[PDB]
Design a protein around this motif. Structure first.
Motif, PDB file in Angstrom:
ATOM      1  N   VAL A  11       8.297   7.030  11.457  1.00 51.04           N
ATOM      2  CA  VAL A  11       8.281   8.285  10.714  1.00 51.04           C
ATOM      3  C   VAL A  11       7.211   9.182  11.326  1.00 51.04           C
ATOM      4  O   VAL A  11       6.048   8.802  11.446  1.00 51.04           O
ATOM      5  CB  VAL A  11       8.018   8.094   9.213  1.00 51.04           C
ATOM      6  N   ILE A  12       7.642  10.390  11.658  1.00 48.73           N
ATOM      7  CA  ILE A  12       6.837  11.395  12.351  1.00 48.73           C
ATOM      8  C   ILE A  12       6.499  12.485  11.354  1.00 48.73           C
ATOM      9  O   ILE A  12       7.390  13.040  10.741  1.00 48.73           O
ATOM     10  CB  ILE A  12       7.613  12.020  13.505  1.00 48.73           C
ATOM     11  N   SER A  13       5.221  12.769  11.146  1.00 48.72           N
ATOM     12  CA  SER A  13       4.776  13.844  10.267  1.00 48.72           C
ATOM     13  C   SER A  13       4.492  15.109  11.071  1.00 48.72           C
ATOM     14  O   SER A  13       3.950  15.049  12.172  1.00 48.72           O
ATOM     15  CB  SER A  13       3.544  13.427   9.487  1.00 48.72           C
ATOM     16  N   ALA A  14       4.799  16.255  10.485  1.00 50.41           N
ATOM     17  CA  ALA A  14       4.641  17.504  11.143  1.00 50.41           C
ATOM     18  C   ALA A  14       4.447  18.619  10.092  1.00 50.41           C
ATOM     19  O   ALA A  14       4.671  18.443   8.870  1.00 50.41           O
ATOM     20  CB  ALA A  14       5.870  17.789  11.995  1.00 50.41           C
ATOM     21  N   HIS A  31       9.830  26.297  12.662  1.00 49.34           N
ATOM     22  CA  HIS A  31       8.984  26.658  13.752  1.00 49.34           C
ATOM     23  C   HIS A  31       7.709  25.863  13.529  1.00 49.34           C
ATOM     24  O   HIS A  31       6.924  26.165  12.619  1.00 49.34           O
ATOM     25  CB  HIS A  31       8.817  28.165  13.712  1.00 49.34           C
ATOM     26  N   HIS A  32       7.596  24.754  14.244  1.00 48.78           N
ATOM     27  CA  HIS A  32       6.567  23.744  13.950  1.00 48.78           C
ATOM     28  C   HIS A  32       5.348  23.847  14.856  1.00 48.78           C
ATOM     29  O   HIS A  32       5.433  24.311  15.996  1.00 48.78           O
ATOM     30  CB  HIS A  32       7.126  22.306  13.996  1.00 48.78           C
ATOM     31  N   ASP A  33       4.221  23.393  14.320  1.00 52.92           N
ATOM     32  CA  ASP A  33       3.050  23.096  15.103  1.00 52.92           C
ATOM     33  C   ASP A  33       3.313  21.964  16.084  1.00 52.92           C
ATOM     34  O   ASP A  33       4.266  21.190  15.940  1.00 52.92           O
ATOM     35  CB  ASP A  33       1.942  22.723  14.152  1.00 52.92           C
ATOM     36  N   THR A  44      10.588  25.999  17.843  1.00 54.43           N
ATOM     37  CA  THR A  44      11.505  26.110  16.712  1.00 54.43           C
ATOM     38  C   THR A  44      12.605  25.082  16.936  1.00 54.43           C
ATOM     39  O   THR A  44      13.214  25.029  17.995  1.00 54.43           O
ATOM     40  CB  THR A  44      12.060  27.524  16.595  1.00 54.43           C
ATOM     41  N   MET A  45      12.809  24.222  15.930  1.00 57.14           N
ATOM     42  CA  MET A  45      13.679  23.055  16.067  1.00 57.14           C
ATOM     43  C   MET A  45      14.548  22.918  14.840  1.00 57.14           C
ATOM     44  O   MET A  45      14.114  23.226  13.737  1.00 57.14           O
ATOM     45  CB  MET A  45      12.823  21.776  16.242  1.00 57.14           C
ATOM     46  N   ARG A  46      15.780  22.442  15.010  1.00 58.57           N
ATOM     47  CA  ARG A  46      16.655  22.168  13.873  1.00 58.57           C
ATOM     48  C   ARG A  46      16.465  20.713  13.406  1.00 58.57           C
ATOM     49  O   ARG A  46      16.524  19.775  14.203  1.00 58.57           O
ATOM     50  CB  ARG A  46      18.118  22.368  14.259  1.00 58.57           C
ATOM     51  N   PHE A  47      16.169  20.564  12.128  1.00 59.40           N
ATOM     52  CA  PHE A  47      16.016  19.248  11.516  1.00 59.40           C
ATOM     53  C   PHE A  47      17.180  19.039  10.566  1.00 59.40           C
ATOM     54  O   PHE A  47      17.695  19.990  10.002  1.00 59.40           O
ATOM     55  CB  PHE A  47      14.660  19.184  10.808  1.00 59.40           C
ATOM     56  N   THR A  48      17.570  17.785  10.379  1.00 56.45           N
ATOM     57  CA  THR A  48      18.769  17.441   9.629  1.00 56.45           C
ATOM     58  C   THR A  48      18.426  16.915   8.234  1.00 56.45           C
ATOM     59  O   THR A  48      17.560  16.026   8.074  1.00 56.45           O
ATOM     60  CB  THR A  48      19.556  16.321  10.393  1.00 56.45           C
ATOM     61  N   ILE A  49      19.106  17.474   7.250  1.00 60.27           N
ATOM     62  CA  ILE A  49      19.058  17.012   5.893  1.00 60.27           C
ATOM     63  C   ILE A  49      20.069  15.900   5.752  1.00 60.27           C
ATOM     64  O   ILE A  49      21.244  16.057   6.165  1.00 60.27           O
ATOM     65  CB  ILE A  49      19.424  18.114   4.874  1.00 60.27           C
ATOM     66  N   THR A  50      19.661  14.765   5.215  1.00 61.08           N
ATOM     67  CA  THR A  50      20.561  13.671   4.865  1.00 61.08           C
ATOM     68  C   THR A  50      20.612  13.600   3.338  1.00 61.08           C
ATOM     69  O   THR A  50      19.841  14.241   2.636  1.00 61.08           O
ATOM     70  CB  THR A  50      20.131  12.338   5.430  1.00 61.08           C
ATOM     71  N   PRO A  51      21.593  12.877   2.796  1.00 67.06           N
ATOM     72  CA  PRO A  51      21.660  12.786   1.343  1.00 67.06           C
ATOM     73  C   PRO A  51      20.437  12.181   0.690  1.00 67.06           C
ATOM     74  O   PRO A  51      20.181  12.459  -0.492  1.00 67.06           O
ATOM     75  CB  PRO A  51      22.863  11.868   1.129  1.00 67.06           C
ATOM     76  N   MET A  55      14.116  16.403  -0.886  1.00 64.65           N
ATOM     77  CA  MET A  55      13.984  17.818  -0.878  1.00 64.65           C
ATOM     78  C   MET A  55      13.031  18.317  -1.956  1.00 64.65           C
ATOM     79  O   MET A  55      12.763  17.650  -2.971  1.00 64.65           O
ATOM     80  CB  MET A  55      15.372  18.499  -1.022  1.00 64.65           C
ATOM     81  N   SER A  56      12.568  19.531  -1.730  1.00 66.03           N
ATOM     82  CA  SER A  56      11.889  20.254  -2.777  1.00 66.03           C
ATOM     83  C   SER A  56      12.183  21.715  -2.530  1.00 66.03           C
ATOM     84  O   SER A  56      12.960  22.037  -1.651  1.00 66.03           O
ATOM     85  CB  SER A  56      10.415  19.916  -2.811  1.00 66.03           C
ATOM     86  N   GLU A  57      11.677  22.567  -3.415  1.00 69.88           N
ATOM     87  CA  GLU A  57      11.976  23.989  -3.334  1.00 69.88           C
ATOM     88  C   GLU A  57      11.207  24.576  -2.168  1.00 69.88           C
ATOM     89  O   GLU A  57       9.981  24.624  -2.143  1.00 69.88           O
ATOM     90  CB  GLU A  57      11.621  24.737  -4.627  1.00 69.88           C
ATOM     91  N   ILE A  58      11.959  25.018  -1.202  1.00 71.98           N
ATOM     92  CA  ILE A  58      11.388  25.625  -0.011  1.00 71.98           C
ATOM     93  C   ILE A  58      12.223  26.847   0.331  1.00 71.98           C
ATOM     94  O   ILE A  58      13.438  26.920   0.059  1.00 71.98           O
ATOM     95  CB  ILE A  58      11.398  24.685   1.218  1.00 71.98           C
ATOM     96  N   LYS A  59      11.569  27.786   0.976  1.00 75.43           N
ATOM     97  CA  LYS A  59      12.283  28.981   1.390  1.00 75.43           C
ATOM     98  C   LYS A  59      11.811  29.458   2.746  1.00 75.43           C
ATOM     99  O   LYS A  59      10.726  29.098   3.206  1.00 75.43           O
ATOM    100  CB  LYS A  59      12.137  30.073   0.307  1.00 75.43           C
ATOM    101  N   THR A  60      12.623  30.308   3.376  1.00 75.72           N
ATOM    102  CA  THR A  60      12.259  30.979   4.630  1.00 75.72           C
ATOM    103  C   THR A  60      10.845  31.595   4.500  1.00 75.72           C
ATOM    104  O   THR A  60      10.498  32.156   3.471  1.00 75.72           O
ATOM    105  CB  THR A  60      13.351  31.999   5.011  1.00 75.72           C
ATOM    106  N   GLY A  61      10.007  31.376   5.493  1.00 71.03           N
ATOM    107  CA  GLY A  61       8.611  31.820   5.426  1.00 71.03           C
ATOM    108  C   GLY A  61       7.607  30.841   4.875  1.00 71.03           C
ATOM    109  O   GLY A  61       6.400  31.017   5.075  1.00 71.03           O
ATOM    110  N   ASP A  62       8.057  29.775   4.196  1.00 77.34           N
ATOM    111  CA  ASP A  62       7.063  28.782   3.670  1.00 77.34           C
ATOM    112  C   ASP A  62       6.468  27.964   4.793  1.00 77.34           C
ATOM    113  O   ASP A  62       7.205  27.516   5.698  1.00 77.34           O
ATOM    114  CB  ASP A  62       7.662  27.807   2.656  1.00 77.34           C
ATOM    115  N   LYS A  63       5.160  27.721   4.718  1.00 77.14           N
ATOM    116  CA  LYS A  63       4.526  26.680   5.424  1.00 77.14           C
ATOM    117  C   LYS A  63       4.923  25.412   4.699  1.00 77.14           C
ATOM    118  O   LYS A  63       4.836  25.307   3.471  1.00 77.14           O
ATOM    119  CB  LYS A  63       2.992  26.778   5.432  1.00 77.14           C
ATOM    120  N   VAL A  64       5.389  24.447   5.492  1.00 72.37           N
ATOM    121  CA  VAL A  64       5.822  23.149   4.992  1.00 72.37           C
ATOM    122  C   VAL A  64       5.193  21.995   5.767  1.00 72.37           C
ATOM    123  O   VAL A  64       4.792  22.124   6.973  1.00 72.37           O
ATOM    124  CB  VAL A  64       7.389  22.979   5.068  1.00 72.37           C
TER     125      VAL A  64
END
Length: 84
Positions: A11-14, A31-33, A44-51, A55-64
Motif C-alpha cells: 500500500v502506497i500513501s500519497a 495531481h499528486h506530490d 497528474t495520474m488517474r487512480f481507480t475506484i474499486t467497490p 470513499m469520502s466526500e471529496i471534490k475537484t480542488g481538494d487536497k487529499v
C-alpha cells in the motif's frame, strides 16, 4: 538472491489535489506530490475506484491523502479523504 514472490501489493500513501472525479468510469484524477516509494515525480495520474475503496466526500480542488496499490496494471485506491 531469492526471487520468489508472495505477490502481495504494498500500500502506497500519497497526497495531491483532485482534478477530476468520474464515479461512473471509476476514476479519480489527482495531481499528486512526488511518491518516493514508486519513484514518481509530481504528475497528474488517474487512480481507480474499486467497490471496496473507502470513499469520502471529496471534490475537484481538494487536497487529499490517499492510499493505493499497484495491481492488475492499475492503481487501485484503498481509501481517500481530505487532507491538510
Amino acid at each position: 538472491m531469492e526471487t520468489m514472490s508472495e505477490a502481495q501489493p504494498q500500500v502506497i500513501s500519497a497526497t495531491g489535489v483532485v482534478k477530476g472525479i468520474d464515479l461512473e468510469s471509476k476514476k479519480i484524477t489527482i495531481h499528486h506530490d512526488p511518491i518516493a516509494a514508486v519513484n514518481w515525480p509530481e504528475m497528474t495520474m488517474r487512480f481507480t475506484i474499486t467497490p471496496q475503496t473507502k470513499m469520502s466526500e471529496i471534490k475537484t480542488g481538494d487536497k487529499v491523502a490517499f492510499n493505493f496499490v499497484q495491481q492488475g496494471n492499475l492503481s487501485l485506491l484503498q481509501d481517500i479523504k481530505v487532507s491538510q
